[PDB]
Amino acid sequence: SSVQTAATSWGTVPSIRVYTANNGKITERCWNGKGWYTGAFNEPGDNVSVTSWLVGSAIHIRVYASTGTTTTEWCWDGNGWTKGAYTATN
Amino acid sequence: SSVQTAATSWGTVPSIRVYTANNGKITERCWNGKGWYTGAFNEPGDNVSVTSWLVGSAIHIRVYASTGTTTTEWCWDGNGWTKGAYTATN
Amino acid sequence: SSVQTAATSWGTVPSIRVYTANNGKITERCWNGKGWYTGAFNEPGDNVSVTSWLVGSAIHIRVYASTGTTTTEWCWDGNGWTKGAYTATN
Ligand SMILES: OC[C@@]1(O)OC[C@@H](O)[C@@H](O)[C@@H]1O
Ligand SMILES: OC[C@@]1(O)OC[C@@H](O)[C@@H](O)[C@@H]1O
Ligand SMILES: OC[C@@]1(O)OC[C@@H](O)[C@@H](O)[C@@H]1O
Ligand SMILES: OC[C@@]1(O)OC[C@@H](O)[C@@H](O)[C@@H]1O
Ligand SMILES: OC[C@@]1(O)OC[C@@H](O)[C@@H](O)[C@@H]1O
Ligand SMILES: OC[C@@]1(O)OC[C@@H](O)[C@@H](O)[C@@H]1O
Numbered sequence: 101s102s103v104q105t106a107a108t109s110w111g112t113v114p115s116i117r118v119y120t121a122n123n124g125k126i127t128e129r130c131w132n133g134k135g136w137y138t139g140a141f142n143e144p145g146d147n148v149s150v151t152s153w154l155v156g157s158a159i160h161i162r163v164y165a166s167t168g169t170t171t172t173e174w175c176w177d178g179n180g181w182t183k184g185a186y187t188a189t190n
Numbered sequence: 191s192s193v194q195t196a197a198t199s200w201g202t203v204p205s206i207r208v209y210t211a212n213n214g215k216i217t218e219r220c221w222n223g224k225g226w227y228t229g230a231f232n233e234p235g236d237n238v239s240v241t242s243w244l245v246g247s248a249i250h251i252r253v254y255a256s257t258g259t260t261t262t263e264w265c266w267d268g269n270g271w272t273k274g275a276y277t278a279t280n
Numbered sequence: 281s282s283v284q285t286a287a288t289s290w291g292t293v294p295s296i297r298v299y300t301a302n303n304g305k306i307t308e309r310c311w312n313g314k315g316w317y318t319g320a321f322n323e324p325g326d327n328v329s330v331t332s333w334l335v336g337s338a339i340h341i342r343v344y345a346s347t348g349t350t351t352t353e354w355c356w357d358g359n360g361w362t363k364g365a366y367t368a369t370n
Binding site: 145146147149150151152153154155160162164166167168169171185186187188189 | 281282283284285286287288289290291292294296298300302309311315316318
């Protein structure tokens with residue numbers, strides 16, 4: 101009966117990304133040090149998790165969006181979201 | 191029908207914080223290397239997520255507490271919890 | 281009505297671990313840079329969260345598995361999963 105969130109952060113400013121699953125859709129709010137704003141992530145899902153890592157100064161984000169028993173991985177690597185290779189079996 | 195948790199950690203000892211949403215309330219358990227104990231975080235919420243980052247040796251924690259469609263951000267920056275600026279729109 | 285996931289990552293390749301709670305059981309999918317595969321974690325739980333940290337190059341993972349109001353901590357420290365000391369009270 102409530103939305104479900106997932107959060108990641110990087111750097112020292114820092115950058116924060118908060119993903120919210122709400123009525124089957126996942127959206128993204130962003131902080132880069134001076135105000136929250138809406139990010140470019142908008143994908144179907146009833147459940148979300150997230151992890152991220154740096155390579156040097158370059159951020160890489162992985163968002164795991166689940167509907168039913170199907171989890172779709174979404175990838176940010178500095179220049180657009182792409183579908184990742186994650187599968188739950190095989 | 192089960193509680194919902196979120197976890198973060200920092201350092202090498204390490205420090206761990208585990209947040210549990212239970213019957214609309216979020217509480218905090220803490221590990222600083224030698225035993226679990228109850229933390230000072232106690233706020234309403236049906237869902238919780240968390241992220242944290244270091245600036246030097248200084249930890250900063252952000253806990254996202256959601257009830258219905260409203261997410262409240264709680265901030266630890268070394269000396270007490272404060273409400274953060276996060277909003278889901280505007 | 282959907283599975284619930286939790287994700288962690290470490291290093292630069294990176295390593296990713298994704299935990300899925302599905303019908304009361306938590307399983308693990310792994311990425312070490314070249315293909316997803318099934319990990320050795322398989323434990324009861326309706327809800328999962330995870331955190332991890334490095335000591336030097338050595339990864340340490342903590343998975344928090346909850347059923348009802350009982351959260352069990354599972355520990356990876358390079359050579360097998362063990363039950364952790366976490367308790368929600370006392
Ligand atoms: O500056 C915001 C942004 O570009 O940051 C990286 C990702 O979080 C994107 O979805 C997002 O739109
Ligand atoms: O470059 C994207 C990718 O290779 O990154 C590592 C993992 O997240 C993979 O599933 C994903 O396809
Ligand atoms: O030592 C425990 C503590 O001070 O650590 C930082 C935050 O997790 C606080 O809520 C918590 O009470
Ligand atoms: O100092 C607190 C604060 O500015 O930290 C960064 C973000 O978490 C903000 O929403 C929050 O208000
Ligand atoms: O290489 C996979 C593996 O050994 O990595 C560390 C842990 O995630 C284990 O459960 C997992 O089987
Ligand atoms: O070595 C395992 C252990 O001591 O690691 C730190 C915490 O996760 C504890 O609950 C856990 O028992």
